[PDB]
Amino acid sequence: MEIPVIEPLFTKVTEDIPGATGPVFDKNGDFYIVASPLSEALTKANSPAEAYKASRGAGEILRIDLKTGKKTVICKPEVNGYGGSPIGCQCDRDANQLFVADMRLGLLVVQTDGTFEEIAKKDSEGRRMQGCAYCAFDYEGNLWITAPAGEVAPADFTISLREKFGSIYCFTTDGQMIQVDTAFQCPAGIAVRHMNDGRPYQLIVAEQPTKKLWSYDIKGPAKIENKKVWGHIPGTHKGGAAGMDFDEDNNLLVANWGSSHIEVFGPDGGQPKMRIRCPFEKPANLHFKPQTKTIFVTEHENNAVWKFEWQRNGKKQYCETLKFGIF
């Protein structure tokens, strides 16, 4: 019949964060969120004129106190007077720093004290870098990245909502920014499926407006092939798959922005196995709290962050692993 639905109790975490996104935990269990006024301007009326304007500003990386919901500004990135537009974050393993996809600046590495380095003006072949949105570390330390925006600053902001110029990258452990595919209409969330023993072997990439999840076989660092449609995202609403994350049994949980649901895919994809009804239309991003069943969810109806309890712990993030396994 219909896909099965559950409807958990979501508890409020924090609010008043436009385009709330990039939830992430660092190595000390500090919780961060990113504010994206550019995202908000893109989902509103007169978005052409509004978002162009909003792209001259800077988004924010915030630390959230989990008890009180109080926000502290960590970083308002900008380079040569071009404001950053961060979206998605991952924490590094060997040092306590955030890798941050940025739609104007590319990829950033942001320290807890608020300094940041911009990683790449150009890719490995000398093409100008594209603005990035979501990223995912594999257990080998390669960062897989979606790039829905056009060329990074100083180019005017452009985004692949209608036209197919969104790209995929892999930033390798030895410092190469390699473009691994292109021609997506607004690629969004990205994730890496691993074998039980740690080998990365499948890349899952969200393509938002087309309501598809794509998969590739991972052959090695920056080596992907056998592009296929892997999952179908329900609904005909404006929006689609955004952020996504794995639980410890490799179920993929996907924010279906505009649908009021987080979709749950099993290891083999296809149709979602279940759906999770949210008390808001626009779930945008999600992230498990380390060693818990707790999922943190950002949403653009109330511009807030919430949490709920899932069936099992999240997949261990890269930052939770140990370089030598036992130490």
Side-chain angles (χ1 to χ4, degrees), residues 227-255:
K227 187 180 174 158
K228 274 178 179 175
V229 175
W230 181 86
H232 301 280
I233 297 286
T236 44
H237 55 279
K238 190 161 200 152
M244 64 186 45
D245 209 9
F246 273 123
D247 76 18
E248 76 176 10
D249 283 15
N250 319 301
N251 307 121
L252 190 62
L253 288 87
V254 180

Side-chain angles (χ1 to χ4, degrees), residues 121-310:
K121 305 202 175 285
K122 282 165 172 172
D123 68 25
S124 60
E125 306 264 3
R127 287 173 298 246
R128 287 182 209 181
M129 187 61 192
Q130 291 179 238
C132 293
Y134 304 81
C135 56
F137 269 122
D138 63 32
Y139 287 154
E140 269 165 37
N142 302 307
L143 189 74
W144 297 89
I145 311 163
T146 58
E151 300 183 340
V152 290
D156 284 344
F157 171 70
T158 60
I159 189 165
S160 67
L161 300 172
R162 288 170 65 259
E163 294 298 324
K164 294 170 99 82
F165 57 86
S167 292
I168 316 295
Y169 294 89
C170 181
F171 180 69
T172 68
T173 59
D174 60 36
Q176 286 184 285
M177 183 63 79
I178 309 173
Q179 193 185 70
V180 291
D181 202 10
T182 192
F184 276 75
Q185 203 188 332
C186 188
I190 187 164
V192 179
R193 171 175 261 109
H194 296 264
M195 293 294 282
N196 291 334
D197 74 339
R199 190 173 76 86
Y201 76 106
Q202 197 180 50
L203 184 72
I204 308 282
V205 178
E207 182 177 46
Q208 195 177 75
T210 64
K211 299 304 186 302
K212 294 161 172 188
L213 301 174
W214 300 83
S215 64
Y216 297 86
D217 294 316
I218 298 168
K219 289 312 181 184
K223 305 184 189 197
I224 52 163
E225 57 185 48
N226 192 25
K227 187 180 174 158
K228 274 178 179 175
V229 175
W230 181 86
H232 301 280
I233 297 286
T236 44
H237 55 279
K238 190 161 200 152
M244 64 186 45
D245 209 9
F246 273 123
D247 76 18
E248 76 176 10
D249 283 15
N250 319 301
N251 307 121
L252 190 62
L253 288 87
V254 180
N256 186 2
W257 197 102
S259 75
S260 304
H261 291 82
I262 294 165
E263 316 297 350
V264 184
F265 294 85
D268 289 332
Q271 296 296 136
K273 292 309 188 183
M274 318 163 46
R275 313 181 82 193
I276 305 181
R277 191 177 203 99
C278 303
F280 36 80
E281 284 174 29
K282 302 165 180 195
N285 212 337
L286 67 93
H287 197 89
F288 278 89
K289 182 183 178 211
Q291 284 291 122
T292 80
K293 287 187 252 286
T294 314
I295 302 182
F296 287 67
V297 180
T298 69
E299 56 97 354
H300 303 338
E301 188 183 320
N302 312 110
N303 286 342
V305 185
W306 307 74
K307 62 165 168 170
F308 79 102
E309 301 302 301
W310 173 240

Side-chain angles (χ1 to χ4, degrees), residues 18-161:
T21 192
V24 64
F25 285 87
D26 72 11
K27 288 168 76 211
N28 311 317
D30 280 330
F31 182 56
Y32 310 72
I33 292 287
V34 343
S36 173
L38 184 58
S39 295
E40 183 163 61
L42 283 162
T43 70
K44 181 181 39 195
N46 214 329
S47 57
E50 285 270 307
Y52 187 57
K53 174 152 162 183
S55 74
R56 303 186 307 249
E60 296 173 325
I61 306 167
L62 313 159
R63 183 183 73 241
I64 314 294
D65 186 8
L66 292 174
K67 288 175 196 179
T68 67
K70 77 144 161 71
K71 306 168 269 180
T72 315
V73 173
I74 291 301
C75 180
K76 283 179 220 154
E78 72 88 31
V79 183
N80 305 318
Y82 291 101
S85 182
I87 301 283
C89 312
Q90 294 282 101
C91 189
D92 197 10
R93 182 193 65 190
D94 296 334
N96 197 224
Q97 54 191 3
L98 303 175
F99 283 69
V100 183
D102 185 305
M103 281 201 304
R104 299 291 295 126
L105 298 178
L107 177 62
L108 306 180
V109 172
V110 176
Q111 299 305 131
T112 60
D113 72 8
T115 63
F116 64 96
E117 171 183 29
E118 171 189 25
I119 296 301
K121 305 202 175 285
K122 282 165 172 172
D123 68 25
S124 60
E125 306 264 3
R127 287 173 298 246
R128 287 182 209 181
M129 187 61 192
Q130 291 179 238
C132 293
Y134 304 81
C135 56
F137 269 122
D138 63 32
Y139 287 154
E140 269 165 37
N142 302 307
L143 189 74
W144 297 89
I145 311 163
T146 58
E151 300 183 340
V152 290
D156 284 344
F157 171 70
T158 60
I159 189 165
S160 67
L161 300 172

